[PDB]
Structure formats: structure tokens, C-alpha cells
Design an enzyme around this catalytic site. Structure first.
Site, PDB file in Angstrom:
ATOM      1  N   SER B  11     -16.355  26.988   3.904  1.00 31.59           N
ATOM      2  CA  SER B  11     -17.052  26.478   5.075  1.00 31.59           C
ATOM      3  C   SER B  11     -18.025  27.527   5.586  1.00 31.59           C
ATOM      4  O   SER B  11     -18.797  27.275   6.508  1.00 31.59           O
ATOM      5  CB  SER B  11     -16.062  26.099   6.178  1.00 31.59           C
ATOM      6  OG  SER B  11     -15.157  27.150   6.439  1.00 31.59           O
ATOM      7  N   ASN B  98      -4.386  28.322  11.614  1.00 30.73           N
ATOM      8  CA  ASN B  98      -4.146  27.037  12.266  1.00 30.73           C
ATOM      9  C   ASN B  98      -4.481  27.048  13.736  1.00 30.73           C
ATOM     10  O   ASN B  98      -5.066  26.094  14.236  1.00 30.73           O
ATOM     11  CB  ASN B  98      -2.696  26.579  12.079  1.00 30.73           C
ATOM     12  CG  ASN B  98      -2.351  26.293  10.630  1.00 30.73           C
ATOM     13  OD1 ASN B  98      -3.166  26.512   9.727  1.00 30.73           O
ATOM     14  ND2 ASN B  98      -1.133  25.818  10.394  1.00 30.73           N
ATOM     15  N   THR B 143     -34.699 -11.836  30.557  1.00 27.18           N
ATOM     16  CA  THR B 143     -33.397 -12.374  30.229  1.00 27.18           C
ATOM     17  C   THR B 143     -33.613 -13.098  28.900  1.00 27.18           C
ATOM     18  O   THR B 143     -34.370 -14.068  28.831  1.00 27.18           O
ATOM     19  CB  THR B 143     -32.916 -13.314  31.356  1.00 27.18           C
ATOM     20  OG1 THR B 143     -32.153 -12.553  32.300  1.00 27.18           O
ATOM     21  CG2 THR B 143     -32.062 -14.420  30.834  1.00 27.18           C
ATOM     22  N   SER B 265     -53.787   6.790  14.778  1.00 29.88           N
ATOM     23  CA  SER B 265     -54.626   6.689  13.600  1.00 29.88           C
ATOM     24  C   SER B 265     -56.072   6.961  13.983  1.00 29.88           C
ATOM     25  O   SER B 265     -56.538   6.545  15.047  1.00 29.88           O
ATOM     26  CB  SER B 265     -54.491   5.289  12.986  1.00 29.88           C
ATOM     27  OG  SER B 265     -55.305   5.124  11.833  1.00 29.88           O
ATOM     28  N   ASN B 273     -48.016   4.838  17.482  1.00 31.01           N
ATOM     29  CA  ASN B 273     -46.672   4.681  16.947  1.00 31.01           C
ATOM     30  C   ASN B 273     -45.687   5.455  17.806  1.00 31.01           C
ATOM     31  O   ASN B 273     -45.828   6.662  17.989  1.00 31.01           O
ATOM     32  CB  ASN B 273     -46.611   5.204  15.512  1.00 31.01           C
ATOM     33  CG  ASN B 273     -47.524   4.443  14.577  1.00 31.01           C
ATOM     34  OD1 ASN B 273     -47.415   3.227  14.435  1.00 31.01           O
ATOM     35  ND2 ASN B 273     -48.424   5.156  13.927  1.00 31.01           N
ATOM     36  N   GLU B 278     -38.122   5.800  18.184  1.00 34.62           N
ATOM     37  CA  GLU B 278     -37.433   5.334  16.988  1.00 34.62           C
ATOM     38  C   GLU B 278     -36.470   6.391  16.441  1.00 34.62           C
ATOM     39  O   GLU B 278     -35.406   6.065  15.916  1.00 34.62           O
ATOM     40  CB  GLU B 278     -38.446   4.908  15.941  1.00 34.62           C
ATOM     41  CG  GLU B 278     -39.320   3.783  16.432  1.00 34.62           C
ATOM     42  CD  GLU B 278     -40.389   3.402  15.448  1.00 34.62           C
ATOM     43  OE1 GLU B 278     -40.612   4.171  14.497  1.00 34.62           O
ATOM     44  OE2 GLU B 278     -41.013   2.337  15.632  1.00 34.62           O
ATOM     45  N   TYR B 305       0.167  20.267  10.180  1.00 31.47           N
ATOM     46  CA  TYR B 305      -1.186  20.634   9.776  1.00 31.47           C
ATOM     47  C   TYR B 305      -1.491  20.143   8.369  1.00 31.47           C
ATOM     48  O   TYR B 305      -0.616  20.151   7.497  1.00 31.47           O
ATOM     49  CB  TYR B 305      -1.384  22.147   9.849  1.00 31.47           C
ATOM     50  CG  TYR B 305      -2.753  22.596   9.371  1.00 31.47           C
ATOM     51  CD1 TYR B 305      -3.847  22.616  10.234  1.00 31.47           C
ATOM     52  CD2 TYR B 305      -2.953  22.987   8.049  1.00 31.47           C
ATOM     53  CE1 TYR B 305      -5.105  23.013   9.788  1.00 31.47           C
ATOM     54  CE2 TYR B 305      -4.195  23.383   7.596  1.00 31.47           C
ATOM     55  CZ  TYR B 305      -5.269  23.396   8.465  1.00 31.47           C
ATOM     56  OH  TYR B 305      -6.499  23.804   7.991  1.00 31.47           O
ATOM     57  N   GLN B 310     -10.134  19.904   8.349  1.00 27.43           N
ATOM     58  CA  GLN B 310     -11.351  20.708   8.148  1.00 27.43           C
ATOM     59  C   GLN B 310     -12.651  19.931   8.357  1.00 27.43           C
ATOM     60  O   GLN B 310     -13.713  20.521   8.564  1.00 27.43           O
ATOM     61  CB  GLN B 310     -11.395  21.281   6.731  1.00 27.43           C
ATOM     62  CG  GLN B 310     -10.530  22.479   6.488  1.00 27.43           C
ATOM     63  CD  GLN B 310     -10.957  23.247   5.247  1.00 27.43           C
ATOM     64  OE1 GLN B 310     -11.135  24.462   5.295  1.00 27.43           O
ATOM     65  NE2 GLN B 310     -11.134  22.542   4.136  1.00 27.43           N
ATOM     66  N   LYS B 313     -15.445  20.322  11.885  1.00 23.30           N
ATOM     67  CA  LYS B 313     -16.577  21.199  12.142  1.00 23.30           C
ATOM     68  C   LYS B 313     -17.943  20.575  11.938  1.00 23.30           C
ATOM     69  O   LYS B 313     -18.737  20.517  12.872  1.00 23.30           O
ATOM     70  CB  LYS B 313     -16.460  22.471  11.311  1.00 23.30           C
ATOM     71  CG  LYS B 313     -15.277  23.329  11.700  1.00 23.30           C
ATOM     72  CD  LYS B 313     -15.165  24.556  10.819  1.00 23.30           C
ATOM     73  CE  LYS B 313     -13.858  25.278  11.089  1.00 23.30           C
ATOM     74  NZ  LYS B 313     -12.687  24.390  10.790  1.00 23.30           N
TER      75      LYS B 313
END
Lengths: 447, 447, 447, 447
Positions: B11, B98, B143, B265, B273, B278, B305, B310, B313
Site C-alpha cells: 500500500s 491492527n 413541477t 467555441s 459548455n 457535469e 481482523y 485494507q 484507505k
């Protein structure tokens, strides 16, 4: 008008349980309309009488749902008119179904949350009380399903109880945000008649009122939250189910379920199937499915009201019923559970005491790294001699380290082993007992 | 060990960011060890110094991670050994990976949740503030995405602020439970050194200490709650993105995004855009995906355990990295967005006043359904005369209901329509004003 | 308690629809038992006739469900015994609820899938037909909900049809794996009577026989697949619903739903709420939830059979009922909606032709980069002149580039714009017709 | 917060592995342009040679990624201009990122799927092979994790191999829909240069080309389908991990994992933790989370292209990496694990033969009910006698039922038990051999 479309809109099939809260909401609304002058004291008197009759028809089970009833609100609305005539139409002034819908669900939920809370706390009480009584039982603790070290059966029971206690805590928070009256929000902009929401609140017993109309009729947070709480709770029970299913195998032989919560076979009675536990474990997915559905339903929906929101009832109804039942079954399993001390004791192996041997030395000023090596050596020596670590003589130990005084004998005792963990949340009897006390105080606060 | 399994166990690739909190746990723990007679003042001094030097190296970006560093906890241990030597080996006396891992995570999350709330409140403030300035703006209320009735722009911004505040309440709640010290729980049975957990708490600044060693080591509720809170927050933001996107279409024209949060553009100067919105909307699924995975990872796991844990994270780092950015971008969009009062008002149609026409007769004592039929006759009449309802003559109105008087003119005004909703939570200016205040206090209580 | 678990274990409330398939399984089994010499020809005849009678009862709707019936399988066994005596018990020889339940679901699903397939094909067919008839309608093509370039309405309709065609393809794949006989697997080790599974396959009309007894009994892949297929299908429909809802806004005005598929207002005759589309959209979350719940139920389950597996029924029943209705509503919405060629064409603006202006230059021999700048200069110049791109005179064009000529007028024509897309799959008329034919070729294979 | 949004778009951090496929698509497009007359033979050869250079820079790991590169597609475009000059700009003619993106993933996935396929097939081969070798080992079959009846160890391995072959079957179907060329679709209406899509298909080695441009640009079906396949595959693996995690407990003692796939203790040599099996089980949620995210991202998106679609890369990359690793680890575990035939046989109990006792009477002509009851009595008699049914005297059996003869002694043999299951899919040796042959042929078809 399409026949399939009508069908897809018919909630009447499942929302019938919202009958009373509907009436309860209509009466309160009728009272506020009188305050607004819309209804004369006499009309209100007549309306409240009609409404009260509807409740009786529902209670007795003599209420007849007409083909035209698409939902509960409608069914009861129709019956009111059928009873008090056209005056019943006035009750509609100003409100909207958008307004009624959320008020109905929240009201139903408050009631449901209370029953669920009671059962949850009872599950906890059952866990702590059984922990107290069986505080002397010691069994193996598992990491990777491999026996790691001794622990008391009570530390195991308490770990589940402690987790469930956070569930009651979350439940309380959820219940707080559900106790906000949305009634009087109209269809989108608020109630047009400048109605008195405070009156509605006090009438329905809500703790407060919604700040914004648009939000109140379009949000389903209270549903998502209830669903998440229900999901974590079910994860907790799934973990407990897994443990007890594994502990109840012939292989482990740690405990046995009551005949009331298991299934056997006349052909081989020894085989006791944990139906109860398997049913509880499976409900985790079912509940999760409900959380996932409502989250996807709400994603990307624009303001304000949309029909998509109608998916909520079936989700909360299914989770409420599942939890109410599941909780009761869990309490039943734990309380009528038959523990086997002998088998638990037999699982305890002297090899698990190798670490305690190292701790013994660490306490005698021997640095960790060194103490760890001495234990390993002892494990190897015992091996070469054909015996077990607890069978090594003082002389053998001395060969390894002169620090090994005669008192090292006390290390080879599973209870003494468990009694090392006296720090706040460990397995020592003192810690366990402290936990029982802490949890009992929590339940008092109702958390 | 197999090369691939080793890669899967590593990790060190993403947990490096937990370096400071590892050091913090180690320092506090070193102090407790000295107090337990495990370390001498001189040993404590030497170690703390070593720990400080490792911090220095991470800060300067000069720490070297060797190929054999499985994870962050390991990296720092090796470095301490390389710095101060063998006495470093005494730091891990009674400590387990642990209880280290959960302490690291909770600690990191504490810090992250503070930053995130800062951004959450900045977003809420922004919405409340703009709402105050643009309180006089009116636009259509929708609505089912159809124009329903006049609504104040501010009432719309506030519906989002109100939802976002509930998120704040939930963020506060998860922090409460994240602020519990799990260190000193050992591998599962607790710490065998009778270590002062209370001292560890003070040092690390947690509010309380875990009640059960097994639970503290195995529970991941804090991860679940945070992801659950994050998901709801995103649901709120994706809805907000949906609205602003639709409102920014050439077809609606209600608003425009600043060039900083969009893309255009050269060939098409007016085509803007809404990328920001988005991206924000897409993160909802990303965050929900992390919640779903952790629930699945947790479902059915037995005590205590397991390596499965793991997976926490990466899920946590991702969500913290997503919210921080998304909340900041959301703030920028709301603040620099330009509204068109022109297009907003121009979207208000006379048809939208039909309901008010009914509200009017209701006020004149006319029963709801009677008032509703009359407005229907009025609209149909105007229809059969090719005219807008507001252009129906008084005589026409009286030809429908005698109760229509000259004052019915006031009805045909959007501001007048908006003002009807003076009730708590409505759109009337007074109601919007109150909401702005109530939220200001809500935010005020952020400490 | 026991009674709670009892109700929690009962499925008769919903699995009654598995009545006929259960009867079918039993009849095949009886025939194979007779062949195995377990039943006499006479006994066979009695059992078959009895099974036919029970079938009739359910068909007529007069089947009496005794309170002892925990599920459909037990219900029918009770009845058979009640109709032909003790010989009915011989029918259970070598059978188990384990292989009964999977045969039941596969048979039901194999039937349901035929119905869904039919409705799916009808939807596609409907989309393709309207696309053919309305092949000349042109409207704006969207990207980020901003106008990009003109496209033919048919290109829009076909994009949904091709996606739905892949769902239709996945459906056949799924149906292929459901068509595998699991009956004759017993509890887990297989059938101990050396029964003829080939005969069973033939009788039940299955394509093949299950390879392994343990897998056949514990696998629910056929359910996960069906649900995975159903979820993607809904994602497509939710995208389609999203398009039609936006296009039916008064702001867009491209189309209007039929009266049968929308809700209006007496006071607002022009307010058409897309109830049908919103329902379809919301069914995505509902179906997804079923996928997620079953995925969680199976995660981490040990071999072989486990009571967790019973959550499958309600999941498929719900999804089957949802898809059947939603497909029928979607087809109706498409077949009966009215488009506004007027509004669609109005939405087309000159600015959208700027890109075509650059293409014109590219075809003249002008390098892409340069042709792009020229168009931008043409756009800006128009801006400064207060006119549109199509209004620029040859004089103005020539000053930008000598390559502009009289034929440049052809550029400013939307139809001419669309017709550039003749390459396979594009919007040109030749492409649209090619798609229509290809999709029809495909549907002929789906039958 | 513009820089925040800018960082949100920087996919360059992860999409770099798409370098080769981007280069590949470009070279196919360059050739097509030349054919369409957009490029001269000389410009073409210059671009192709330039593209080759970039390819090498990537292969040598010398490619300098400047901090202005948003994504891999851009980075490469930049480099080509820096090599060939303004001629590179010609490649952009009529192409779009919307178009490139989908082609990039499709090519990456096609290659990645070949790798996954081989690893999947290897796992299946290993399971089928170990089943042939260890065909004589018998152990208990479990239902509800309670000993049911004796099965052959090979039946257990084959039950998993068969489920895995279905996964393989699904991978091929997915593969087929991924092998469709989307390039040539343009931004949304298709390619305007009348580009030869068949040429592109040939060059890029796709099986067919997209039917509709709008669909090719917006759909992500191939991503969801791959994710679904991946999730089910992981569901199958999580179950296999669970089985092996339990079977390797000290309590079960059926098998031991290799040192390469477990972790032990210095102080507890006989404790081996199933790390490999826990990592595998934990990935099911990780993969599931990616499936859930993408589905949530696609829900309710309008046509055609939206930035939301950008979330697909990480999802696919994470799952391809995870599956590739997990599959190799799974194969390792199965191939190197140690089986304990002695502990397996020891698990076999006489009680498990009670059902065979009933079967014995059925073969004598005794009806099922009578046989099941007589067996039940023999089980009870033994119990009351403190002995096992296999120790019941012929006299005792004849007192239960005269039907019991001397040959009943053969029932009390676990091999004879297993051997009754000769019907297809059963546990008899002949039936297990047949499965192996059937698997072998299937593996030939799908590789």
C-alpha cells in the site's frame, strides 16, 4: 388514461398502512383551515366526525376500496365525501398531494422508528446481560479465522453490542431530522392561505417545521438516512450471523441454537441447520438494495417535484418490516443460545501462550526483540523434546534465559493470560465489567 | 511469498500521505511506553528525536522509500532503525498494525473532515448571500419540468442551501464518532502493558477512547458513515448541477457560467459548455461506488481482523480528494454565475395565474371546487375568445361568478402572486428574508 | 421468536405464481420415476391426473391455501396427497427442495423472457418505423445540452434503437444459459436413483442438462445475469426518457406526449406533465437495487446450499413485472407522441453552420488549421457587423480567403449540412436508410 | 477555483497507458485521410514516420510529458507537431475527441481481455486437472455449513470450474460487442469527409463498425458489460475463497496453503493465515463498486456526449489490473495447496448414511415415506443404545423392519454412498470423469 399507466401509478396496493396518518394529517389540516376562517366551527365539527368514522372503518377492517382508488389519500378522501357530502371538498383548499405525501411518510416513519428502537435496545440488553452472566467463559480469539489468543466469551459478545450501540445512536440522529413537519408547504411555493404551520406542528407532534417549501416537498434525505442506518445495522448483524454460523458447526462445536431458531432432520438430528442466522445474513443484501435504489432514483433529478419520488414508500415499508422482524429473531437467537464451555476450553492451545512468555520477559526488563527471540527458542526446544511449551521445565527455560525465574509457571494459565488486558477496553475481567457498566449507562440515555 | 501477492499487499503506493499521522501515533505511544516503565527517559528522548527527524525528511521531500517498504508504517520503522538503531525496536512493544492502521485513518480523516466542512460552509454562505442580493428576482417554478407558478430566484437558491445544511449536520455527526481513540487495543484483546490509553488520547487529541478492543480493531463504521454522508452530499450537488445545466441552455437562458467554469467555441461564440456542472454531476457515481464497495467488503466478514479491511484507505482518500475539489468548484460556479432577470421574467405566463384566480374566489367565501370550476370556465372562455385570462372583462368574470369584483385585477400580477405565500417557508419576500436569517444562525453555530 | 422466523421463512405469499411450473416439474419427475421402476404405470396415471386437477384449481383461482403451506412446493404436495392418497408420497423419492426451487425459477424466467423479448422487439420496431416515416425532420444535435450541429430526427430515434438492439442481443444470451435443466441434482450430490435426466430435459423442453450437482443447486448466475441485463436496458430507457422530457418542455417545444401518457390541468390546458417518462426513468433505480441486493446476497457464501439464496424470487418477480409494463408504456409514448417540425426547425441557427464553412474551405484545398481560423474571422466579422454568418457577402468572404466562391451559399443550408454525413452511420439520408435496413435485418434474427 | 477544475480534467495522470492505442488509431486515420484526398502520399509518410517516433519514445520511457497536456491524446498531438511540423495539424481534419476516446478504450480493452482470458482459462485448467488426479478423495458435502452427505473432493473442485467456464462464456460475448469500430463517428453526426470506415476497421482489426454515430459516441455499454462480467467472476472467486478459508481452519483441517500464499507466526509455527484468500475475497467489493459507479454515472444522461462519460477510464483500468492479479493468485493457491485426505475421511460420520438406509428400503420396494420412517427409527434405536447406526445388529434392523437383510451392511460404506450418484452431474466416479471430459471440450471452444 393508458391501462398500464394507471396500474403503474396505483400505490393503493401497498400504501393502505398510511391510512391513519393520512386521517391524522387531514384532521390537523381541518383544524388549521378553521383558524384561517375557511371552515366554520360547525363544518370542522362535521369533518372531524366524518374522519373519525373513517378510522373506525379501517380499524374494524370494513373499509371497501373502490376501483377508482389510486392511493390511500384518495380512498379516504372519497369516503369522507360519501359520508359528509360536498363539505368534504373544502378540506382540499390550499394543500397538495406533494405536501401530504412527505407528511404521511415521515409520520409513518416516526412511529416505525420507535418500535425498531425498542427492539434494537432489547438486542443490546440481551447481549450485555448474557455477557455479565457468562463472564467466566474463555475461548479463542480469531484473526484470519486462525486462533490467535484467549479472550472471554463476554468480550466477543460485547464487541457486537458496542457496534449496535452506534446504530441506536445513528437512529436517534435520523429520528431528529424526520421530526420536521413538511405539511403546509403546498405544491411548490408554500401554502397560499397563509396557514398557521405552528398549529399543524403541535397538532401532529412534530418537533419543528421545514424551512423551505421547495426543499420540503422534493427531498428524500430522511429516506436515504434511514436506509443507510438500516444498512450498517444489517452489516453488523451479518457479521454476527457469520460468527455464530461458524461457531455452531460440528467442527467448532462452540454452541448450539435453540430448536425454535433452527431446522433439523429426523434422519440425523445432530444436524442442526442455522436457518435463523442465514435469514438474518441475507437481509443485509435486501436492505442494501433498497438504499442503492433510492440513491439512483434521486441522482440528477431537477427541482422540484417529479413522479420518480413515488419509489420511496415500497423502500421504507420493506426495510421497516425487515428490521422489525430481523431484530426480534436476533434477540431470540442470542437469548436461547446454548454455549459449550468444554469445547471452548478445549480449543485453547498452549502454543497460544508463546507470546505471553515473551511478555513475561518484557516485564523483566528484557527488550521486546530479545524477549521475542527467547520465546521462539523455547517453542523450538519444546518441539525437539516432543512436548508442549507449558511442559518445559524451569531448567529448560533457564538454558534459554536466566531471567526465567520459577514464577514463569503462572504464564501457562489461560485465565492469567486473559487477565493481562486490564487497559480500558481489553479482556481482563475488570475491563469487561467496566464495559458492561458503560453500555448499561448508554442504554439508559437510550443510545 | 509470491511476487504478485506481495504487490497486492503493498500500500506504500498510496498510503505515504499517512506519514505524519504515523509519526504522531508513534510519538504519543513512545511517551506512554516510558510511563509504563518500558522505556527510560533517555530512550524516550532518543526515539522522539529520531521520529522528529523522519518527519523532517518527509516535509523536505527527501525521505527515501526502499523497494522493500510494504507500507508507510513499515517505511518509518525502518528509518527509525536506520537513524537511532536498535532501541527503535522497543517502540513496537505491545503495539499491533491492527490498532495502528485504524488510528492512522481516523486521525487523517479528522483533519480531512475539518477542511471539507470549511468548504461546505463556504458553499452554503455563498448561496445564502446571493439569495439576499437577488431577493427581488422572479422566475418560473417547475413541477415535472413544466412551468407551474411564479417563484423567487432566492427561494430556489435557498432550497439547495437548506439541503446542504443537513449535510453539515451529518458531517458534524460523523466527526463525533471518528473522534474516538482506538490505539491501545493491541491485536485484538487489548494492550498487554496496562498502558495509559487516557494519556494516548490527550496526546493525540481524540475526545474519547474505544470501549472494546475487538470492535475498535475490526469496525469500519466510521468509513461507512463518511462515505454515506459523502454520497448524500453528492446527490444534493448533482441535482443542483442538473438545474443549472438546464437553466443554462439556449432554450431556457436563465443564466450563464463564467468563462472560468465552462468551455466555448471560437466558431460558436455563444455556445458555453457547462463542464464544471457535469464533472460535479459525474462525481456522484464515483463517490457512491466507494460506498458500495466498502459495504460489500464488510458484509459477512467474521470477527475479528481480516485482510479484507485494507480496502478502506483507497476508498477514503478518493472521496476526500473528490469532495474538496467539487465543493470548491461548486462555490466558484455559484458565485460567478450570471443570471438573466429578463429571460426569467419573460418566462412568466398569464396561464400561471389561473390558480390564483381560484384562490381569490376562495377568499370571497367561495367553496374550493366551486372556485376551481369558475377558474376553469374563465380559462376556457378566454380560450374560446383567443385571449389571455388576464384580458377577460369584469362582465365576463361576473358572467361566471357574481363574486368577481374589480379587485380581481390585483390577482393578475406575478409579485402579488409570489406574495400570497407568506406562511413559514413560502416564497413571499418576508418568508425568504426569515429563511436567510435562520440559515445565518445555523451557519454561525459552526464552531 | 419462532412464529416471527416462521413468517420470515414463508414464501407462499408471493411464490404462488410458480404454481404451474411446479406442477410441470412434478409431472416430468413422475414420468422419470416410473421409468426408474419407482412407480407403477397405474401409480403414474393417478399422480399425473391428480397433478392435472391441482393445475385446474389454480387456473380457476379456487386453490385453497392452508395455513400450513409455507411455500408453493409444499402447497401442491398437500393437495396431491389430499386427492390421491398415500401414493403421492412416492413422488418425493430422491427429490429435494434444492433442485426443485431452481427448476421452478428457470422455467418461470424462461417463460417471462419470451414475453419481455416480444415487448422489446415491439419498441425497437416502433422506433425504426417512425424513423422511416419522419426521415426528413431536422433538429439540433446536442452535446453538453448545447446546440452543436443539425441532425435528422431519425438519427436521434435510431441511436436509441441500436442501443436497445444490443439489449435484445444480451437477452438471447441470457435466455440461453437459463435453458439448462437443473432438476435431478438432489440436495447436492446428485440424484441417487440413476434417474433419466435426458427424459426430464425433453419433458421440460430444456436445451441442455446441468453439468454439476453442487453448482446447479447453489448457482444464481442466471438471476444476476437477468438483472444485469435488465439494469442496462433501463439505463437506456432512462436516457430516452431524459431526452423526451427535456424536448417536451415548453422551452424546447419539440414534441408533445399523448393524453394517455401525460397529466394536464383544467386551469392550465397547456401544462403536460410527462408522467409516463418519469415513471420509466425511476424504474432504473428500482431495477438496479435488485441487481445490487442479489450481488450482495451471494458475496462470500460457502458451498453448497444456504437459506440466503431464497431472496432471489422476489427480485426476479419484481424486475419481470417492471420491465413488462415499462416496455409497453415506452412503446406507446413513441407511437403516439406529436412532434413539432416547426419548432424543431426554428431551433436551427446559422451559427451552427460555422463548422461547415470551414469544411467548405478544406474541400477547396485549404489546410485544416487555416480553414478553421478563416471561419472564426468570418464569425467575428459578422458579429461586429451585427449580422449572421449566412448574411456575409462574397466581398467580405473574399477578404478573408480567396477560396470563397458563389457556391459558398450552399453551405448555409441545413439540409446540405446534414447530407455531408454519408459515411456509414452518419446523419445523411443514405445512412439513415442503411441503418433502418440493418436494424430490420437484425430483428429478423432476434426471432 | 478555475485551476481546481483544470486539475479535474487532467486525465494525463492515468490515461498514459493509452499511448500505443492512440498512436494506432492515428495511423489508421492518417491513411484514411490520404485515401479521402485530405493528405498527399508525402504528408502521409511524414506523419506515419513521426507517429513511429512517438511510439518509440513511449516504449523507451523517454517521452517528456509537458504540464500543458490534459490527456494522452493531446500530449501525442503536441509531440507530432514538434516532430513533423504543421503537417500534423492535418490529422485533426474531421476527427473528434469524442470519437478518439471510445476507440482508445475499445482497443485497450480488446487487448486486456485476451490477457484476462488466458489467466481465467489457466485457473479452470488447474481445477480440472487437480480433480482428475485427486478423484479418490472423499469429504463431507455441506448445506447450511452442517455436514450433509459424502461427496468426492473432485466434485467440489468441478463445481467451481463449471461456474468459471460460464464466466469465460460471458467474456467472449462481451468481447464481441467491444470489437466494433466507433472511429469515424465524429463529434456526433458522423464523419463529414466521407472517410472509408471499412479501411479503418481493417487497419485497426475490428470485426465490424458502429451502426449509428450518436450511439457510438455516447454509449458505454461495453464498459458496464465488462464490469458485470467482472463482478460475477469475483462473486464466484469470493465464494471459493470462503470455502478454502474455512477448510483451512485448525477446526476443519482439510487443507493447508503454500507458504507463498499465506503468512505464519514465529511463536506459532502451525498458524498460517490465508492472506491470499482474503485479498481475493475483498476485491469482489472493489470491482462491484466500479460497476455501481458507472451505472450511476450513466443513469439519466441526455444525448449525446457529456463530460460525465469521462469517469470510465479509471473504472476499467482498476478492474483490469485487479482481475489480472487476482486470477494469477487464485491459480497459484489452487495449484500449490496441500490436501489432507486423512482429515477429510475422518470428517465422514455414520449418521450421514441414515438417508442411504432409507434408500436401501426404497430399492427393496418399500415406499419413500415408510422407508424414511423406518430409517428414523433405526437412528433413534442406535441413539438410545449409545451406538452408531452402522453398529446396529441385523436383528435390530429386522425389528425395525423385516425388509432389512444381510446386504444392508454394504450401505455402511462411504464409497458405496458416493457411488449411487451415477445420474449425470452426480458424484459417482463415472459422473465426475464425464464432467472432466465435458469441461475439456468447452475449454477448446473458448480460450
Amino acid at each position: 388514461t393508458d391501462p398500464i399507466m394507471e396500474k403503474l401509478n396505483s400505490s393503493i396496493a401497498y400504501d393502505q398502512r398510511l391510512s391513519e396518518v393520512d386521517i391524522q394529517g387531514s384532521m390537523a389540516y381541518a383544524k388549521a383551515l378553521e383558524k384561517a376562517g375557511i371552515l366554520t366551527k360547525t363544518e370542522l365539527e362535521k369533518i372531524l366526525s366524518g374522519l373519525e368514522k373513517i378510522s373506525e372503518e379501517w380499524s374494524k377492517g370494513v373499509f371497501v376500496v373502490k376501483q377508482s382508488d389510486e392511493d390511500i389519500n384518495t380512498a379516504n378522501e372519497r369516503r369522507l365525501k360519501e359520508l359528509i357530502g360536498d363539505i368534504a371538498g373544502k378540506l382540499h383548499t390550499g394543500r397538495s398531494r406533494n405536501d401530504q405525501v412527505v407528511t404521511d411518510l415521515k409520520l409513518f416513519m416516526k412511529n416505525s422508528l420507535s418500535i425498531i428502537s425498542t427492539h434494537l435496545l432489547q438486542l443490546i440488553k440481551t447481549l450485555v446481560e448474557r455477557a455479565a452472566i457468562e463472564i467466566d467463559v474463555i475461548l479463542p480469539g480469531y484473526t484470519h479465522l486462525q486462533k490467535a489468543q484467549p479472550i472471554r466469551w463476554s468480550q466477543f459478545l460485547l464487541s457486537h453490542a458496542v457496534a449496535l450501540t452506534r446504530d441506536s445512536e445513528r437512529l436517534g440522529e435520523v429520528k431528529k431530522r424526520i421530526n420536521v413537519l413538511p405539511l403546509g408547504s403546498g405544491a411548490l411555493a408554500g401554502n397560499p392561505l397563509d396557514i398557521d404551520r405552528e398549529m399543524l406542528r403541535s397538532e401532529l407532534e412534530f418537533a419543528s417545521i421545514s424551512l423551505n417549501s421547495m426543499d420540503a416537498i422534493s427531498e428524500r434525505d430522511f429516506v436515504v438516512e434511514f436506509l443507510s442506518f438500516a444498512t450498517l445495522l444489517m452489516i453488523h448483524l451479518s457479521k454476527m450471523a457469520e460468527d455464530l454460523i461458524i461457531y455452531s458447526t460440528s467442527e467448532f462445536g462452540f454452541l448450539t441454537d435453540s430448536d425454535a431458531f433452527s431446522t433439523g432432520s429426523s434422519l440425523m438430528p445432530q444436524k442442526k441447520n442455522p436457518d435463523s442466522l442465514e435469514l438474518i445474513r441475507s437481509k443485509a443484501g435486501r436492505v442494501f438494495g433498497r438504499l442503492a435504489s433510492i440513491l439512483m432514483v434521486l441522482k440528477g433529478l431537477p427541482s422540484t417535484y417529479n413522479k420518480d419520488l413515488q419509489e420511496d414508500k415500497e423502500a421504507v415499508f420493506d426495510v421497516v418490516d425487515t428490521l422489525t422482524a430481523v431484530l426480534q429473531v436476533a434477540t431470540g437467537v442470542i437469548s436461547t443460545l446454548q454455549i459449550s464451555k468444554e469445547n471452548m476450553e478445549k480449543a485453547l492451545t498452549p502454543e497460544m501462550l508463546a507470546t505471553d512468555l515473551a511478555l513475561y520477559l518484557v516485564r523483566k526488563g528484557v527488550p521486546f526483540r530479545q524477549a521475542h527471540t527467547a520465546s521462539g527458542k523455547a517453542v523450538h526446544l519444546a518441539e525437539t523434546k516432543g512436548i508442549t511449551i507449558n511442559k518445559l521445565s524451569l531448567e529448560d527455560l533457564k538454558s534459554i534465559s536466566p531471567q526465567f525465574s520459577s514464577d514463569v509457571s503462572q504464564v501457562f494459565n489461560f485465565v492469567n493470560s486473559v487477565e493481562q488486558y486490564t487497559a480500558l477496553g481489553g479482556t481482563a475481567k475488570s475491563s469487561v465489567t467496566t464495559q458492561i457498566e458503560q453500555l448499561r449507562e448508554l442504554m439508559k440515555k437510550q443510545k
